[PDB]
């Protein structure tokens, strides 16, 4: 059995080997114990931004500022290239309620749905609410279709951490902890919006990244993926049948050009799983 | 030849608590390798494939308007599994073309129910039979043996061969070298390419040098996926996997990896024979 210093070295070696850099953090939501690799490195968040958008929207609903039943006439994305989902691929206008736009945006990763929600609650207003709740290191700057590893001043706007929506693994772990706190027993988001976001994350349809390594008959996995250019992320919470609960955040960028990298997915998933397993084995 | 490979894959399936119908076919050469490819199983969400085809043919004929806006009652489902309109809380208005996307690519049961109101199960089955497809039954919609859904007498059924034959016909218009209407076929290949449920066979078939277009089916202890892999070098294989598990757990990503590995190894053997024999 490896010691934890040796394990982290093995994991970093494995990531380097597979052409991946990024930000990993796993935390036992009960004890606060955690294990990570570069957990405070800021990367563009791609579709992970849909999480704080959902929470802001849900809070505005609780507040009576937004009506979840409000029917919105949404123009089709008409996108025919690979990747975007839901209304983004529609050919014709659709009419969808705000509550159901939240489902499409958060669970189906539908950027056209997300953009409809951003019209209601703009990026700067989402960010303000996130900051007011005390969340640091999550930026919300632009909607889904506004806009050499990522970096400050990047030529590619979506890879420029000064312009793009960004975050760190730690920022997402802190968010997930706050979302799950109302159901964590034993010795501060409003509980109704938190419960609704947990439900949306459980209903996530994109289960091809970390979910094969985290979901089982004895574990539930609720998560949000993000994929754009050479970015592949996923943040989520695994709930074990024995009651253990871990938040997991993976943000990666690949030095391999190919969009389709199932081996990279398997690798980042194995890394996250080994981090969780070490904490789970930890006395 | 491949007797050894087939025993090895049958062993793996037995050990993993899976039985079913597997078939992989090289769409150019016609060579195929299977495990019980003629065994009838309930098809679950796979029925959305013939439904889409039948609908798309009706659009071509002017019988159905892809632009027609449908007012859809929400599924209001909160338990795990169903997707799209099935999980909506409120009514929504969606065009036929976009219900085809939801049903086929998102596996949305409520969207497929709306499509079945337009082109009902027996009409789909009739259209499929008239095109010459056998061993695909279409009897009920999503929201319609001692378990009803596992009863091959009542349920929508199919065999791996049935699906492989359907996939072959859908891809035929783009297969070069020495019959479905091409527009409906093209639209369905596109819907299949846009499938979102990429957690089953997709990790084993999609790569930088291979595209994977498919449809999954999941119900009770049934776990299926049928699809086509297109290699960067021009090879094309149709893949059909229909399984039922003896293990009662709904969540079995090990079973999913197992069935994907079986299908991939069948393809690999055909790909090797194509290249090297």
UniProtKB/Swiss-Prot annotation, chain A:
Disulfide bonds: none annotated. One of its GO terms (biological process) is response to antibiotic. Coiled coil: none annotated. InterPro entries: Beta-lactam/transpept-like, Beta-lactam_cat, Beta-lactam_class-A. One of its GO terms (molecular function) is beta-lactamase activity. It comes from the Bacteria. This is Beta-lactamase regulatory protein BlaB. It comes from Streptomyces cacaoi.
């Amino acid at each position: 059995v490896l010691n934890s210093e040796s394990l982290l070295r093995e994991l970093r070696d494995a990531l380097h080997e597979g052409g991946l850099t990024g930000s990993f953090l796993v935390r036992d939501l009960y004890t606060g114990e955690e294990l990570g690799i570069d957990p405070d490195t800021e990367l563009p968040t791609a579709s992970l931004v849909k999480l704080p958008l959902a929470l802001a929207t849900l809070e505005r609903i609780r507040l009576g500022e937004v009506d979840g039943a409000q029917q919105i006439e949404v123009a089709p994305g008409r996108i025919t290239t690979p990747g975007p989902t839901g209304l983004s691929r529609f050919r014709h206008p659709a009419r969808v309620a705000v509550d159901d736009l939240l489902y499409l945006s958060t669970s189906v990763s539908d950027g056209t749905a997300s953009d409809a929600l951003f019209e209601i609650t703009p990026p700067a207003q989402v960010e303000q609410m996130v900051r007011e709740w005390g969340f640091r290191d999550l930026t919300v700057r632009h909607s889904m279709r506004e806009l050499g590893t990522s970096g400050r001043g990047h030529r590619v706007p979506q890879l420029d951490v000064a312009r793009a929506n960004t975050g760190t693994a730690r920022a997402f772990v802190d968010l997930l902890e706050a979302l799950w706190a109302p159901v964590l027993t034993g010795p501060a988001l409003p509980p109704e919006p938190a419960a609704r976001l947990r439900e949306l994350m459980a209903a996530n349809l994109l289960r091809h990244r970390l979910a094969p390594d985290f979901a089982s008959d004895a574990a539930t996995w609720s998560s949000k993926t993000g994929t754009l250019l050479n970015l592949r992320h996923e943040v989520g919470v695994v709930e074990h049948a024995d009651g253990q609960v871990f938040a997991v955040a993976v943000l990666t960028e690949s030095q391999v050009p190919a969009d389709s990298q199932p081996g990279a997915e398997a690798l980042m998933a194995q890394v996250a799983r080994r981090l969780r397993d070490r904490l789970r084995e930890w006395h």
